[PDB]
Amino acid sequence: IDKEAMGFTYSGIRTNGATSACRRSGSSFYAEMKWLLSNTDNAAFPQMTKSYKNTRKSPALIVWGIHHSVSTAEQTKLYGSGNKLVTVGSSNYQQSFVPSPGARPQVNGLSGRIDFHWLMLNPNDTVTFSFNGAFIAPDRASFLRGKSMGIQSGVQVDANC
């Protein structure tokens, strides 16, 4: 894959969400993603709308995420009191999203859960994100390279044979 920046800009919110799960130099997050939060704790999350166009000549993999917190309190803590909606939209896509906060068995200590979706953005098309919280945002879009073959194994690699 070849990654390409999507050109998104945010003001009035945070952009440096992190957790003990994704540990880099201390707490961090997904490299090609950006956790978005209300500017301060329990603050208000503004209604935002961001767009990206596939300017290249092959389809573009667009991956976003929804954060179903463990507690409705954590959801108001991060994104703010009030209902939260995410409407992804392209020419082939037309989907809303809503965080369903609820306890889940502790996986990496966090009972919240992130749902990763994806779509193929046709060349010259645009993907539109409209959101006001609980939205893990894409930073770079992925593009395919060439031909390969996917194998799963459990033995050494050997370049001699």
Partner 1 sequence: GLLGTITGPPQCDQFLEFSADLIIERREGSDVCYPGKFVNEEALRQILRESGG
Ligand X SMILES: *[C@@H]1O[C@H](CO)[C@@H](O)[C@H](O)[C@H]1NC(C)=O
The binding track of 15-54 with respect to its own copies, each residue x by CB under 8 A or -, is ----------------------------------x-x---
Identified binder of ligand X from the candidate list 40, 95, 123, 126, rule CB under 6 A: 123
- Considering only residues 82 to 121 of the shown chain, the ones binding partner 1 according to CB under 8 A are 91-92, 94, 107-108, 110-118
Q: Is 158 in the site for partner 1 (CB under 8 A)?
A: no
Give the residue with the Cβ less far from partner 1, 31 or 103. 103
Alpha-helical segments (H) within 26-157: 72-78
Shortest spacing between CB 68 and partner 1, in angstroms? 8
Find out whether 10 and 1 touch, Cβ atoms under 8 Å.
Answer: no
Number of residues counted as binding partner 1 (CB under 8 A): 31
Q: Is 133 in the site for its own copies (CB under 8 A)?
A: no
Q: Is 123 in the site for its own copies (CB under 8 A)?
A: no
Q: How far is CA 50 from the centre of its chain?
A: 13
**Count of alpha carbons within 13 angstroms of residue 16, beta-carbon side:** 5
> Which residues are registered as beta bridge partners of 53?
126
Could you tell me how many helices (H) and strands (E) the chain has, helices first?
A: 1, 12
User: What whole-number distance in Å separates Cα of residue 70 and Cα of residue 30?
Assistant: 19
Find out whether 31 and 14 touch, Cβ atoms under 8 Å.
Answer: no
> Which residues are registered as beta bridge partners of 137?
34
Q: Which residues bind ligand X (CB under 6 A)?
A: 55, 57, 123-124
Q: Which residues bind its own copies (CB under 8 A)?
A: 49, 51, 68, 87-91, 94-96, 98, 100-105, 107, 111, 113, 115, 125-126, 128, 130
